[PDB]
């Protein structure tokens, strides 16, 4: 994961301007999370069936 | 050459969460098993989902889900006006819209080129008056 | 400090109801116009009820001519959710989840809200939202 | 704060005459305030009272 | 606090004055210039029209003095073009006819600034039927 | 360098006429989307002809989602006037004064304009306007 | 003419920012001209009657 | 600019798979650029062809 790559400095800063980020680790992280998310394993996702949701969707909508 | 994201609506999500066994829940399960890479979240949906999470552990779990999925952003230079437009159109058509946040969700979906999987008549209405791609599982 | 007038008060003004909220909005327009702010959730609400073409253009002018307090996609929805949950915990109800959103954005911007909706009364009791009710 | 600047006398006089102000300072302050004030005129803003609104806020908010 | 009831003279009236037609519009313009000079405003769409139709370069120069001299009501592109569009579409929906979309722009800016329009163009008659534009026709 | 697509080209695209202009618009959307810009005079034209509600909403979304090249009140109208005058003196005909405004805007921004309107052909002879005709 | 005058610092600064001006003087002149324009005598204004306008407003409008 | 930062191998690989990129650096670049690029998707933009436009450009211009 320690990875040696060319990252456009301007671009990383440009993202730092736009999103009020104070890093590059912040910009890259965001960039990646937005586009493909974070690792969600198959078992996790399947395990959500029956996890429960006690709120009322009618209250939130109508 | 990337395929269209699939935005699962809160309406379908809830069924899945509750293990109701309805066609919506089954469809969501299928999506999770077979097309996980194409599933997207947006922040209005996320807000809805977390707001109905009463139990704290459950809430925590659902936060993981919502931060784990790729996100289709809300851009307030565009999406709120588009939702308003959608709403007004619906009204003029003589249609009823139960949640203005469904118009927002549809607006963002249209912007992003995403299709919606749902079980809420609002999305049926919206697909009648826009080019929203919506699939009802009710 | 920006003054964010809620839809609830705006509507009073638009319909010339003469209620205290309408009068306060009038006052704001007269004396503190440069401090008045808009946000896109409020804008959406306002335009969604402007079904008359002339009304719509007129209120679109209003929305486009006021400084905007942005919605931050990364946090504001989450904040709103948090607020909602807190309200529930406090044994209160919020009729509209978008009031939570609006309040979140106000808190982020350091803006104060002028309104006539009990939701903001609730939210000021579980956050440091600066809200003034004219109900 | 205080400063020494050139101000076109005639222009200042004109402003004073048109807005019924007695001093250059007042004239300059009013001009600066109008310059950075709302793009929406007082007249337009007060004209909105009774414009109408056809919606139902209860439906939008439940 | 300090009210000012600006009067925006439309190109249509201006032209009458410039040509000395003796029409009621020209006379009204004259009156305005003699009695209400402090209230007269210009805007850049009107200015563009005025300059555009000045064929003689000396006359054009003179006109430039006028349009550069009068207080200006700005066009704000965060607002006014959309408002014009709105006006135009409403007119269309009404079954009304609008000769020039720049008349809708002008009217939009007048409404924003709280100015009244003196004109002789039916477009402004139309626009005052669908908005709260203060307009006075001199045909 | 920004690419302003003129209303004339846009309309071809919207109506799916299959003209060279429509196809070029499509190409632009496909391959050079990041360089496409809008301006408010074009926006006004586009929205004025969008009479259907859905059409108006979606073209509103388009106009709001493209980067805007500003109208500079102090300069651009004067520039347009100048252009018009020059055209008339050249013995040319200009159908729309707002085409002169748009071209002024384009020249000020250093933007090139993609169109199918003879007005821009006229204006590129008498100015430094970068215009690409697909008539 | 030069004069000593109290000008709200903040407003002036704002003006300088918005219009990219580098002096208070410039800011103040801009503000005053927004209010009243530049001097046009009654004589000049009345002298414009009959100056001529040989264009066609129908060309410009329709 | 050459930078060594921890990038999760698997997210980058996912990115590569979805966008048909051959390197992690390219993937990261793309992710950053999408963050500050156009808000209008290709799909939406191409979907506008044939949407219709029922006004008359001659009325607005000629």
Residue numbers in the entry:
A (entry chain H), D (entry chain U), G (entry chain D), H (entry chain K): 2 to 63
B (entry chain G): -3 to 134
C (entry chain E), F (entry chain A): 0 to 134
E (entry chain C): -4 to 134
What's written in the study?
Virulence-associated proteins B and C (VapBC) are the most abundant Type II TA system present in prokaryotes. In the present study, we also show that VapC11 cleaves tRNA-LeuCAG in a Mg2+-dependent manner.
The VapBC11 complex crystallized in the P212121 space group, and the structure was solved at 1.67 Å resolution using molecular replacement, as described in the ‘Materials and Methods’ section. The asymmetric unit consisted of four chains each of VapB11 and VapC11. We observed that the α3 helix docks at the lateral site, while α4 interacts with the active site residues of VapC11. Consequently, this mode of interaction may sterically occlude the tRNA-binding site of the toxin.
